[PDB]
Scaffold this active site. Structure first.
Site, PDB file in Angstrom:
ATOM      1  CG  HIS A  44      -0.429   0.447   2.481  1.00  0.00           C
ATOM      2  ND1 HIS A  44       0.019  -0.445   3.433  1.00  0.00           N
ATOM      3  CD2 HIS A  44      -0.244   1.680   3.009  1.00  0.00           C
ATOM      4  CE1 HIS A  44       0.451   0.218   4.488  1.00  0.00           C
ATOM      5  NE2 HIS A  44       0.304   1.510   4.258  1.00  0.00           N
ATOM      6  CG  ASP A  93       0.079  -3.774   2.980  1.00  0.00           C
ATOM      7  OD1 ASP A  93       0.519  -3.332   1.896  1.00  0.00           O
ATOM      8  OD2 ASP A  93      -0.061  -3.066   4.000  1.00  0.00           O
ATOM      9  N   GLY A 186       2.936   6.465   8.617  1.00  0.00           N
ATOM     10  CA  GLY A 186       4.340   6.787   8.435  1.00  0.00           C
ATOM     11  C   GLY A 186       5.245   5.616   8.796  1.00  0.00           C
ATOM     12  CB  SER A 188       2.842   1.971   6.357  1.00  0.00           C
ATOM     13  OG  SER A 188       1.682   2.331   7.076  1.00  0.00           O
ATOM     14  N   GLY A 189       5.169  -0.349   6.269  1.00  0.00           N
ATOM     15  CA  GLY A 189       6.260  -0.923   5.505  1.00  0.00           C
ATOM     16  C   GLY A 189       7.444  -1.259   6.395  1.00  0.00           C
TER      17      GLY A 189
END
Length: 237
Positions: A44, A93, A186, A188-189
């Site tokens: 995402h 994801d 922020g 995320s990942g």
């Protein structure tokens, strides 16, 4: 990251900050070094990203302030997004970033081991989430990399907190029933790193959650062990 503290420099050598240069350069998402030219992150994170050319990966970074126009970075040669991914809350994801050049490992930048299928059963009691994300719901990207220790929760329990969603086995959650500590926008990942037997494994990838650090609202992460086969297939030239 909510309810966390400042990380020590080099404490999370596999963490990277993924920037976009469009319209102007800014932090976009977190990521994990898993190979010499491979970053594992969230799918995402690339909403609206048409080309790998606006991406820049910075390793060995503690403070965003360290990143300036004269700071070296890794270009992204290819963005590989799981073909079943549609959106964070639906699962899948996960994404791979093939760098244009390889990373020279060193105390400030090195890879984190992927989890083993043989470990699906082991119970981690030492898991941490890191990132330069929000510390509040309506906040901004933080300068110093934050870390927070968070316990893993069973999927049965997680599902009880998200009755409008389908928490699949390809997802993993972590949080305090009372809230207080969690990842946020922020982050995320970024990685969910768990230490077991003196070795760190990349157990999850910050993906989503209802708000941040809310009571009875566990953070939801991609269950990495479920994608080790996908990762091998996608990184094998």
């Amino acid at each position: 990251i909510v309810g966390g503290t400042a990380s020590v420099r080099g404490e999370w050598p596999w963490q990277v900050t993924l920037h976009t240069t469009s319209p102007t350069q800014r932090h976009l998402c977190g990521g994990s070094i898993i190979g010499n030219q491979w970053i594992l992150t969230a799918a995402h994170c690339f909403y609206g990203v048409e080309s790998p050319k606006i991406l820049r990966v910075y390793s060995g970074i503690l403070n965003q302030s360290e990143i300036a126009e004269d700071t070296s970075f890794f270009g992204v040669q290819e963005i590989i997004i799981h073909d079943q991914y549609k959106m964070a809350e639906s699962g899948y994801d996960i994404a791979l970033l093939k760098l244009e050049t390889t990373v020279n490992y060193t105390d400030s930048q090195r890879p984190i081991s992927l989890p083993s299928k043989g470990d699906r059963n082991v119970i981690y009691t030492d898991c941490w989430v890191t990132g330069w994300g929000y510390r509040k719901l309506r906040d901004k990207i933080q300068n110093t990399l934050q870390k927070a220790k968070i316990p893993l929760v069973t999927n049965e329990e997680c599902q009880k907190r998200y009755r409008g969603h389908k928490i699949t086995h390809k997802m993993i959650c972590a949080g305090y029933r009372e809230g207080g500590k969690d990842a946020c926008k922020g982050d995320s990942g970024g990685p969910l790193s768990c230490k077991h037997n003196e070795v760190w494994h990349l157990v999850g990838i910050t993906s989503w959650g209802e708000g941040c650090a809310q009571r009875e609202r566990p953070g939801v992460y991609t269950n990495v062990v479920e994608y080790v086969d996908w990762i091998l297939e996608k990184t094998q030239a």
